Amino acid sequence: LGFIFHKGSYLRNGWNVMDFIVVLSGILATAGTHFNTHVDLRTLRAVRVLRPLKLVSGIPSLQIVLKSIMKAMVPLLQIGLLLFFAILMFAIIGLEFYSGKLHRACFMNNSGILEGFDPPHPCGVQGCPAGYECKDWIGPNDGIT
Amino acid sequence: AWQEIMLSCLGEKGCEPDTTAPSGQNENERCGTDLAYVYFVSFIFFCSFLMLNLFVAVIMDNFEYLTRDSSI
Amino acid sequence: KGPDVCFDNNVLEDYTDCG
Amino acid sequence: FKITKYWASLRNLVVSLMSSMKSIISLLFLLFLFIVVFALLGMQLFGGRFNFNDGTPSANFDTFPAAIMTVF
Amino acid sequence: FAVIAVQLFKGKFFYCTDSSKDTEKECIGNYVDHEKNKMEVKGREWKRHEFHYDNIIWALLTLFTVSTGEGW
Amino acid sequence: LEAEKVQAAHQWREDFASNEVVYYNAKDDLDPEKNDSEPGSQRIKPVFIEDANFGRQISYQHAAVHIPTDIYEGSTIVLNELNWTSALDEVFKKNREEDPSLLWQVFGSATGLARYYPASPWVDNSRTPNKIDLYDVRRRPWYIQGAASPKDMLILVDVSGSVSGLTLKLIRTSVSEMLETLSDDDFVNVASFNSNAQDVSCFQHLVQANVRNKKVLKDAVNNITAKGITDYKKGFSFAFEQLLNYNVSRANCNKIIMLFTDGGEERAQEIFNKYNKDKKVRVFTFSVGQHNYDRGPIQWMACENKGYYYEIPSIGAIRINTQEYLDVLGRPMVLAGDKAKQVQWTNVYLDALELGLVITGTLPVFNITGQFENKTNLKNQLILGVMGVDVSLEDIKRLTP
Ligand SMILES: *[C@@H]1O[C@H](CO)[C@@H](O[C@@H]2O[C@H](CO)[C@@H](O[C@@H]3O[C@H](CO)[C@@H](O)[C@H](O)[C@@H]3O)[C@H](O)[C@H]2NC(C)=O)[C@H](O)[C@H]1NC(C)=O
Ligand SMILES: CC1(C)O[C@@H]2[C@@H](CO[C@@]3(COS(N)(=O)=O)OC(C)(C)O[C@@H]23)O1
Ligand SMILES: CCCCCCCCCCCCCCCC
Ligand SMILES: CCCCCCCCCCCCCCCC
Ligand SMILES: *[C@@H]1O[C@H](CO)[C@@H](O)[C@H](O)[C@H]1NC(C)=O
Ligand SMILES: *[C@@H]1O[C@H](CO)[C@@H](O)[C@H](O)[C@H]1NC(C)=O
Ligand SMILES: *[C@@H]1O[C@H](CO)[C@@H](O)[C@H](O)[C@H]1NC(C)=O
Ligand SMILES: [Ca+2]
């Protein structure tokens, strides 16, 4: 076939471009021993995981089902924009109200070995219950939430 | 985690002091109940059904907007 | 100076209890 | 159900399912291919990196049958 | 599915509170628990898991729990 | 001698409901609480006098029994032991009445029990929170020292990639508690392999296992880190080569390899042919960690090489599997029947029940069921336990006026 310039060429197909990308990364990632992988890629054989999709590329009876499925989801790309708006609108508000107020937790006094609860109990103006003191803390899920 | 609320509402659980009675301090250590299974299995079936209706009753209300077409 | 007598490597030993 | 009046409503459902079966299987198969792709991607990103000092969790990405069942 | 799950997991959802012992004969006594990082002496109990599959009613309940998604 | 004879004449049971066993569990309370007794056994409440010779509450009427906190006081093994070790009480008493200046005399059993004669409450771990009774007689220096002949270990840690995380925490705790079971007559050296073997510490040969060397090895082991592919052949070459190094001081006895791995599919048959051909070196293999890698090769090296295989899947399995390797090493000492019943005295140490500096004389006790009617001898290659009678250093200082 062609490559690009020809109209019906190789890359003008939609699946052949990703077929080509996968084989390109197969050629490149196996060019490591020559340079001892001095580039320190750690990022090119992760294209190998796209190789199962070449089944869809080889069986058009699967593509004309995949296209139907992707066709039924185009109307959804306005709930998504509606969804990502809501997520943003409730994030802005979160930023105003809880922005730094999740960093003190109630740890047992027990100086040295601090204890805390197993579900850690935060502080605020709502202070520590009985014999606990309000120490510093990374966030709730090791700082992620 | 409704399943664990159901399990922690079951029978033989402790009981609150009630600070209003002289008896039933050591006894009435049965302040759960095994109707929790019915209480949570049914609600999860009712709330999940009564919501489905509220969903469909809305969807079918706007079914003209949702099946709008450029032709029609 | 170490102990005079020590016992290892008897031929009669029953090896068939590995685990 | 054959003895009731609901037989048609259900035999027709089974007929419509059995007719469209090369397109239900070829569609569960695409769900399976995308689960496989995401399982292999998760193996690349997180394969063997889950050995924490607590112990590797059951929701691993180390081997394939345990990457499939966490993408699930 | 509940009948199959009973055939498949009946009586197998048992565990000793001490991970080293794995039978009701062995699971008796006291044991030191190191894993709480407090190293405290607890008692060995032989338990079931809370959602098991040892009777078709229990299979149905713990499959309803899977259906609602929670804690599967 | 009495213990050997009495055990040889004990018939196994499982029925202790009506034919009970009565004994004094050292970890009971003084309060007359009948809720302190047991289903399968009945507890003595003793009358304790106070003595200055021991400094504690003594009662010369019976021998106390200490059962570890991990071991159930009423399992079948423990109830059989609590039965057949009740003639020891009258032998204890006759021993004392011959010589009244005798300190603790203890039978430390292979089931974990210790039965010590002048019955006293267990020192500090009877009943009080935040202090747990971690005593286990099968680890005490006199027991380790009478239950086997001196060792030459070489501890082969597997620090490769796959042991990182929990398995490495467990490996370094296991190796610490393996070094803890070593005397001054035993020589040790810790080596670690990942695609090439190297010492974890500064010692390049088998050094003596004294307090200072053991501390160096522990502090090296705790610094160890997991990285790289595993090579069993290159690590076992190192192990076998370090046990053939005779230029150094050694306990020229009981060469051992303690392989602390998790699992693979390498059996290294060729290197066990080339280095351990006539099987002079034993190989004990430990499978540490909660994992799923193959355990076939590990279970096979132990069989091929007179060893034994232990699984250490969590902390709390750490403490038992080491004293188990000693359980194995005492077979040749059993088989040489009465050439092995020599009393041996331990280095000075501090008594568990507080009396200060005491050496202790030990003597292993053998299992003698099938004798003069020679039988299968399934486990007649293990010892019942170790007898040990203490001597105080203050007692020796009175003979040197
Ligand atoms: C000293 O060695 C003797 C044998 O050389 C040990 O005696 C035997 O111990 C085993 C278990 O350790 C007994 O097996 C059990 O027997 C009962 C009744 O037959 C059976 O129900 C169990 O399933 C199991 O087979 C065995 O009976 C017992 N006696 C003999 C004659 O074999 C003895 O335990 C050793 N001493 C110590 C302190 O371990
Ligand atoms: C819009 C709707 C309901 O979904 C589309 C499209 C055409 O039919 C589908 C339905 O799936 S199936 N296998 O039951 O025919 O089948 C395929 C071909 C998978 O596409 C399905 O009809
Ligand atoms: C012209 C018809 C084909 C349309 C273009 C190709 C679509 C399929 C290739 C991309 C599939 C997703 C790849 C990213 C990872 C899920
Ligand atoms: C000719 C067949 C008659 C069957 C009458 C009862 C049919 C009930 C509906 C069957 C739905 C099957 C779905 C199975 C799960 C994918
Ligand atoms: C073992 O138990 C039986 C039953 O009480 C008893 O008769 C026997 O004397 C016990 N053995 C010893 C050595 O005391
Ligand atoms: C031992 O620990 C020290 C302290 O961090 C470290 O610098 C050193 O690298 C460790 N040992 C080796 C051989 O790396
Ligand atoms: C041991 O001594 C011999 C004899 O001097 C010497 O040849 C050898 O290199 C020394 N070292 C070892 C490890 O054998
Ligand atoms: Ca490895």
Cβ-Cβ contacts under 8 Å for F183 (sequence gap 6 or more): F141, F144, F145, F150, F209, F347
What Å resolution does this PDB entry report?
A: 3.0
List the structure tokens of B66: 């949702």
The Cα–Cα gap between E28 and E5 comes to 29
The Cα–Cα gap between F315 and E34 comes to 7
Chain C residues close to F299, C-beta within 8 Å: 18-19
DSSP one-letter string for F214-282 = HHHHHHHHTT----S---HHHHHHHHHHHSS-TTS----S-BEEEEEE---S---HHHHHHTSSS--SE
* Pocket mutation for ligand 4, best pick of D1, D5, D13 (most atoms within 8 Å of C-beta): D13
Quick check: helix, strand or coil at residue F285? Answer: strand
The Cα–Cα gap between F180 and F319 comes to 10
The Cα–Cα gap between F32 and D53 comes to 47
Nearest CA of chain F to the CA of E61: how many Å? Answer: 31
| Parallel, antiparallel or unpaired: strands F42-43 and F22-25 | parallel
Beta strands per DSSP E along chain E? 14-16, 30-33, 40-43, 46-48
Q: Which of F70, F73, F64, F75 is nearest to F108 (CA)?
A: F64
| Parallel, antiparallel or unpaired: strands F357-366 and F349-350 | antiparallel
Question: Do chains A and C have 3 or more beta-carbon pairs under 8 angstroms?
Answer: no
Q: How far is residue E19 from each of residues F70, F216, F238, measured CA to CA in Å?
A: 13, 33, 36
Beta strands per DSSP E along A2-113? 104-108
Chain F residues close to E33, C-beta within 8 Å: 316
> How many CA atoms within 13 Å lie on the side-chain side of F47?
1
The Cα–Cα gap between D33 and D45 comes to 18
E21 phi, psi to nearest 5 deg: -85, 140
List the structure tokens of F312: 């250490």
The amino acid present at B19, given as its one-letter code, is T
Q: Which of F283, F285, F325, F329 is nearest to F306 (CA)?
A: F283
D59 phi, psi to nearest 5 deg: -85, 70
**Test the F interface: residue of C1, C4, C5, C8 with most F CBs within 10 Å:** C8
Q: How far is residue F271 from each of residues A106, F132, F266, F268, measured CA to CA in Å?
A: 58, 45, 11, 6
- Dihedral in degrees, nearest 10, Cα atoms F214, F215, F216, F219: 120
Q: How far is residue F99 from each of residues F51, F75, F94, F112, measured CA to CA in Å?
A: 16, 36, 9, 28
Residue position matching structure tokens 């890629």? A41
Helix (H) or strand (E) holding E60: helix E56-67
The Cα–Cα gap between E35 and E17 comes to 12
Helix F166-179 and helix F211-221: axis angle, to 10°?
Answer: 180
